[PDB]
Design an enzyme around this catalytic site. Structure first.
Site, mmCIF file in Angstrom:
data_model
loop_
_atom_site.group_PDB
_atom_site.id
_atom_site.type_symbol
_atom_site.label_atom_id
_atom_site.label_comp_id
_atom_site.label_asym_id
_atom_site.label_seq_id
_atom_site.Cartn_x
_atom_site.Cartn_y
_atom_site.Cartn_z
ATOM 1 N N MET A 66 -14.446 -8.687 -2.031
ATOM 2 C CA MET A 66 -13.678 -7.696 -1.283
ATOM 3 C C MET A 66 -12.613 -8.484 -0.513
ATOM 4 N N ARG A 67 -11.351 -8.269 -0.848
ATOM 5 C CA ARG A 67 -10.269 -9.104 -0.326
ATOM 6 C C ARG A 67 -9.647 -8.380 0.883
ATOM 7 N NH1 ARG A 67 -7.397 -11.735 -6.041
ATOM 8 N NH2 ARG A 67 -7.998 -13.855 -5.413
ATOM 9 N N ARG A 68 -10.497 -8.102 1.874
ATOM 10 C CA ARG A 68 -10.111 -7.384 3.097
ATOM 11 C C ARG A 68 -10.850 -7.973 4.289
ATOM 12 N NH1 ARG A 68 -7.650 -5.678 -0.634
ATOM 13 N NH2 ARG A 68 -6.986 -3.548 -1.108
ATOM 14 N N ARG B 271 -2.489 -12.490 1.980
ATOM 15 C CA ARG B 271 -3.481 -13.473 2.396
ATOM 16 C C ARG B 271 -2.860 -14.478 3.365
ATOM 17 N NH1 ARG B 271 -8.264 -14.107 0.183
ATOM 18 N NH2 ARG B 271 -7.532 -12.904 -1.630
#
Length: 272
Positions: free
Chosen positions: A73-75, A145
């Site tokens: 999960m890139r949060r 990011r």
């Protein structure tokens, strides 16, 4: 022997200046610095400051509540406990306060806006209209990011993006962690005032029928004797296409991208 990275002003490209040089850069290099694209060093510093403030002063409970439950999960944050990371997408974000959210939402929006505009120029310069139109292609699924480095070397890779926009703050000691392959050599890519660095990614290559290079790059860590004064940050915005974006599997192999799947066509989703 041509190992330099050029700089363009976005506004000037939009006025139709330097067409031939921009086109040649895209084809042969696939990276460039970009000025006049609606990004400020000041806004980068404010976004940076507030995340570092959280890193240093947020409680353990506040940090857990905005920490990615699983990194895939890139949060949210990772590494709050080399580097801490804060990640954002277009939805499902994690914010530690209302002001943080306002600051980082606006920073994300400006980066997304600038990425769309540069990608719009990449498409225009190569006579490219994506299936379904330019606008629907650029209204996509980006990922931001941000990494902060307070206080094994990986092989160079190309990005699975249309474009990637990179802002950084320099090291006090002069160390430059970011390098790309340009003209057969590694070339340093330092902080430059009021400029963002742009990488073309593999999707740029595919959508334009092979008119744009997707250069390989890597981030070096400092050796032992360059560690004092190596604190730095980077802000990487990946303009990733919609999941259903469709490309030719043949053209991808032909371009030197590792594709494991079979068929005439695939979707970005299939690939990633």
């Amino acid at each position: 022997m041509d190992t330099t990275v050029p700089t363009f002003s976005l506004a000037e490209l939009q006025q139709g200046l330097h067409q031939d040089e921009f086109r040649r850069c895209l084809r042969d290099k696939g990276l460039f610095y970009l000025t006049d694209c609606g990004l400020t060093d000041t806004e980068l510093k404010s976004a940076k400051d507030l995340v570092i403030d959280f890193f240093e002063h947020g409680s353990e409970a506040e940090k857990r509540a905005v920490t990615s439950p699983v990194p895939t999960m890139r949060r949210g944050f990772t590494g709050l406990e080399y580097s801490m990371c804060y990640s954002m997408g277009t939805a499902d974000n994690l914010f530690p306060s209302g002001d943080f959210e306002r600051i980082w939402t606006q920073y994300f929006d400006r980066q997304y806006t600038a990425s769309r505009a540069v990608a719009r120029e990449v498409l225009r310069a190569t006579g490219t209209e994506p299936d379904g139109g330019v606008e629907a292609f650029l209204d996509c699924e980006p990922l931001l990011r941000f990494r902060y480095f307070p206080q094994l070397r990986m092989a160079p890779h190309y990005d699975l993006s249309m474009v990637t926009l990179i802002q950084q703050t320099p090291c006090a000691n002069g160390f430059v962690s970011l390098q790309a392959e340009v003209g057969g050599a590694f070339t340093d890519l330092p902080y430059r005032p009021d400029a963002v660095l742009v990488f073309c990614g593999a999707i740029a290559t595919l959508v334009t029928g092979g008119q744009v290079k997707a250069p390989r790059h890597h981030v070096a860590a400092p050796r032992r004797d360059q560690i004092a004064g190596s604190s730095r940050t980077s802000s990487v915005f990946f303009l990733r296409p919609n999941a259903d974006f469709t490309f030719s599997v043949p053209l991808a192999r032909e371009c030197g991208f590792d594709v494991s799947l079979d068929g005439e066509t695939a979707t970005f989703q299939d690939w990633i």
